[PDB]
Motif scaffolding. Structure first.
Motif, PDB file in Angstrom:
ATOM      1  N   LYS A 193       5.421   5.254   2.012  1.00 57.18           N
ATOM      2  CA  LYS A 193       5.071   6.666   2.107  1.00 57.18           C
ATOM      3  C   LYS A 193       6.131   7.482   1.382  1.00 57.18           C
ATOM      4  O   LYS A 193       7.312   7.427   1.738  1.00 57.18           O
ATOM      5  CB  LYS A 193       4.956   7.111   3.566  1.00 57.18           C
ATOM      6  N   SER A 196      -1.740   0.623  -5.056  1.00 56.79           N
ATOM      7  CA  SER A 196      -1.589  -0.686  -4.437  1.00 56.79           C
ATOM      8  C   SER A 196      -0.946  -1.645  -5.429  1.00 56.79           C
ATOM      9  O   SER A 196      -1.208  -1.568  -6.632  1.00 56.79           O
ATOM     10  CB  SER A 196      -2.939  -1.244  -3.969  1.00 56.79           C
ATOM     11  N   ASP A 227       1.865   5.548  -1.137  1.00 55.03           N
ATOM     12  CA  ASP A 227       1.370   6.916  -1.266  1.00 55.03           C
ATOM     13  C   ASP A 227       2.170   7.701  -2.305  1.00 55.03           C
ATOM     14  O   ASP A 227       3.132   8.397  -1.970  1.00 55.03           O
ATOM     15  CB  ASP A 227       1.414   7.636   0.084  1.00 55.03           C
ATOM     16  N   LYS A 254      -2.033   7.729  -4.281  1.00 50.17           N
ATOM     17  CA  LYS A 254      -2.253   6.439  -3.642  1.00 50.17           C
ATOM     18  C   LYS A 254      -2.305   5.322  -4.678  1.00 50.17           C
ATOM     19  O   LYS A 254      -2.852   5.492  -5.772  1.00 50.17           O
ATOM     20  CB  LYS A 254      -3.548   6.466  -2.831  1.00 50.17           C
ATOM     21  N   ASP A 272       0.857  -1.178   0.000  1.00 47.29           N
ATOM     22  CA  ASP A 272       0.000   0.000   0.000  1.00 47.29           C
ATOM     23  C   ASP A 272       0.896   1.231   0.000  1.00 47.29           C
ATOM     24  O   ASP A 272       1.634   1.464   0.964  1.00 47.29           O
ATOM     25  CB  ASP A 272      -0.938   0.009   1.208  1.00 47.29           C
TER      26      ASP A 272
END
Length: 229
Positions: free
Chosen positions: A127, A32, A26, A30, A24
């Motif tokens: 992130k 995946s 960012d 965003k 997951d």
């Protein structure tokens, strides 16, 4: 193996282990990524196919290679005592990284690598901040290839784990090079004993390819990792 602890970690990677990778990620775009394949630790062999489940991947695929299972590295017989990744199984270990891109943003990744039955699972949260929207990363100016590297694995005895920092050099489409400075730390999940290694190297070797029948944004990866030192 004379060492029964080594026999414990090596027994889990004797044959072909199925792998599942979930990420997951960012600036705040965003996305995946789901990866599946097999790992053959007796040979350092890695065969994985990742798929961007959210559509178009907002970053280049090669920049996620180091993020997207070092427990499948081939440790020579005289170095089985220095295999921290396998010795932390099946409880697993946590892999954390901060990847600095020269004159661009940075990745901050936290990973949980553990066994779920016969399947080795890699859980990643990524992130990324302070990236240039039109830079190399967010502008997709990197070539679709990879190089061979030697990373230095040292142990941290106050965390009961390992640490490593190395430089990955992505190729920009104009002939220049984009630096990705990695800083890495690994700690065990369980409370049991692990193998804190001496200083050694991991020789890497990767190939990036495309599935001609896959219409989703994806990456095929063939990787070989073997320890030396």
């Amino acid at each position: 193996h004379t060492d029964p602890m080594v026999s414990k970690g090596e027994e889990l990677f004797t044959g072909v282990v199925p792998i599942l990778v979930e990420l997951d990620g960012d600036n705040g775009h965003k996305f995946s990524v789901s990866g599946e394949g097999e790992g053959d630790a007796t040979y350092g062999k890695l065969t994985l196919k990742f798929i961007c489940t959210t559509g178009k991947l907002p970053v280049p695929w090669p920049t996620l290679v180091t993020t997207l299972v070092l427990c499948f590295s081939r440790y020579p017989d005289h170095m089985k005592q220095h295999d921290f990744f396998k010795s932390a199984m099946p409880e697993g270990y946590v892999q954390e990284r901060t990847i600095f891109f020269k004159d661009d943003g940075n990745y901050k990744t936290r990973a949980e690598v553990k066994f779920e039955g016969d399947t080795l699972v890699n859980r990643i949260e990524l992130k990324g901040i302070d990236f240039k929207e039109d830079g190399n990363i967010l502008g997709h100016k990197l070539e679709y290839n990879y190089n061979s590297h030697n990373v230095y694995i040292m142990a941290d005895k106050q965390k009961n784990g390992i640490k490593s920092n190395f430089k990955i050099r992505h190729n920009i489409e104009d002939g220049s090079v984009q630096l990705a400075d990695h800083y890495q730390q690994n700690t065990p999940i369980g409370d049991g004993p692990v193998l804190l290694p001496d200083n050694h190297y991991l020789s890497t070797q990767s190939k990036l390819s495309k599935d001609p029948n896959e219409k989703r944004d994806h990456m095929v990866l063939l990787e070989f990792v073997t320890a030396a030192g």
